[PDB]
Nucleic acid binder design. Structure first.
Length: 179
DNA sequence: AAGAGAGTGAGGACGAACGCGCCCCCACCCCCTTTTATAGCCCCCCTTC
């Protein structure tokens, strides 16, 4: 096809294996913000990997914003080490990528009206609710946002191969509906 | 041969039962938050005349 999706967001969850005191972490952590009224977790952000991590008192943490699997793990390790430096016995257990988000352009306009008619069983096109077309890929469990401008967003993938496979499947379909 | 007490028929007030709710407590789910690209829609605020 000549176009490879670019991972825009990587969401991974890891378990530190230790109950945490959210109030203590916020008071000591450099970039952590805690608001039990708003959310029950602790939001911490770092610059070099450019990721945001939510820390829960149960010891489980969710890292988001990473643009690659390697960055996500490194960012998650940095958050885990920071909590460890605060006096907790934080570890790195069962690190897993929960969701991957990719974006790409087909370099041509797409007729969403024709696409949904031919793929009604997978396409839900409601301009009132959202201008983009929501395509739910089946063989890969991937949900794709196809837009008239040609931009395509892939989400719900657990591994990078799923993103590339999903885009490969959809590209010929989109090519047939070129405007 | 004559008094209180009583049988009977008969009317009037009261307690337990029957509903008939209005309030409550326990599952179940949803929502909160964060990240990201995308495009359209819409709202608040600023500026020009």
């Amino acid at each position: 096809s000549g176009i490879v999706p670019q991972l825009q967001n990587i969401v991974s969850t890891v378990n530190l294996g230790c109950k945490l005191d959210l109030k203590t972490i916020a008071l000591r952590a450099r970039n952590a913000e805690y608001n039990p009224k708003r959310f029950a977790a602790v939001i911490m952000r770092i610059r070099e990997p450019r990721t945001t991590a939510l820390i829960f008192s149960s010891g489980k943490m969710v890292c988001t914003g990473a643009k690659s699997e390697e960055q996500s793990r490194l960012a998650a390790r940095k958050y885990a080490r920071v909590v460890q430096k605060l006096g907790f016995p934080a570890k790195f257990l069962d690190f897993k990528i929960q969701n991957m988000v990719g974006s790409c352009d087909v370099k041509f306009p797409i007729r969403l009206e024709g696409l949904v008619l031919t793929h009604q069983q997978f396409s839900s096109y409601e301009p009132e609710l959202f201008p983009g077309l929501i395509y739910r890929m089946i063989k890969p469990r991937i949900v794709l946002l196809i837009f008239v401008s040609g931009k395509v967003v892939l989400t719900g993938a657990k591994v990078r191969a799923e993103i590339y496979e999903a885009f490969e499947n959809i590209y010929p379909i989109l090519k047939g509906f070129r405007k």
